[PDB]
Write a protein that binds this ligand. Structure first.
Ligand SMILES: O=C1C[C@@H](c2ccc(O)cc2)Oc2cc(O)cc(O)c21
Length: 214
């Protein structure tokens, strides 16, 4: 109560300002966070909160052309978010579930979105089909009540690690690993790309990276 403390919240939901993945001494900083909102029968429902993490100095070193751009200029530029999705650096997304769902509901819905988005880009082949089956089957085994957490980890752009946490803590190891460049990138693109499910997360990340680069 006597020294400065930093708190980050997304509509009241706390996010850690930094996360150090188990097995690593490298700290990932929260770049930005937002919500997945869905308008259902005119009701604006917040169903998850999404936080995006990376090593600040490292990711800045891979985004140098954007230096000096304001958050507004970045948020309006699809090229910026494509650079961010492709940057060859470690990334972590933390999802806090707001509206409880079955794992099979989550996995099925997101898998179909990635299937469709990859198909739209002509990046859907048998390899991606198989990887998406692995993704879906992982979630079929899980329950996602309010307050549960999904961790998506990209130790490199082509590798996706997944865990589900009941208490927000990171497990000592990933529960599932999906090795497919297109699926790994497409999942990150669900959050940061065009027709993103979370414009708020994108805007927040634009604010964070704009500040970081300055
Ligand atoms: O209703 C949905 C939609 C679902 C979803 C995921 C991916 C996709 O492509 C479409 C929908 O995400 C959610 C996540 C929740 O915690 C609660 C929810 O009710 C939902």
């Amino acid at each position: 109560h006597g020294m400065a403390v930093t708190k980050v919240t997304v509509d009241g939901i706390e996010f850690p300002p930094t996360i150090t993945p188990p097995g690593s001494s490298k700290s990932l900083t929260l770049l930005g966070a937002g919500v997945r909102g869905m308008e259902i029968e005119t009701i604006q429902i917040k169903v998850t909160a999404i936080g995006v993490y990376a090593e600040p100095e490292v990711i800045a070193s891979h985004l140098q052309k954007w230096k000096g751009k304001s958050a507004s200029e970045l948020v309006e530029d699809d090229g910026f978010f494509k650079d961010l999705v492709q940057a060859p650096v470690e990334k972590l997304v933390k999802i806090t579930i707001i509206k409880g769902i079955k794992g099979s509901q989550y996995g099925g819905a997101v898998e179909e979105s990635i299937r469709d988005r990859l198909a739209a880009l002509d990046k859907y082949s048998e390899a991606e089909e198989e990887a998406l089956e692995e993704f879906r089957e992982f979630f079929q085994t899980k329950s996602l009540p309010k307050g549960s957490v999904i961790f998506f980890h990209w130790p490199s752009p082509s590798t996706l690690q997944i865990s589900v946490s009941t208490d927000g803590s990171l497990p000592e190891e990933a529960e599932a690993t999906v090795e497919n460049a297109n699926v790994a990138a497409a999942l990150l693109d669900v959050f940061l790309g065009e027709n993103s499910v979370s414009p708020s997360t994108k805007a927040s990340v634009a604010e964070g990276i704009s500040a970081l680069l300055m």
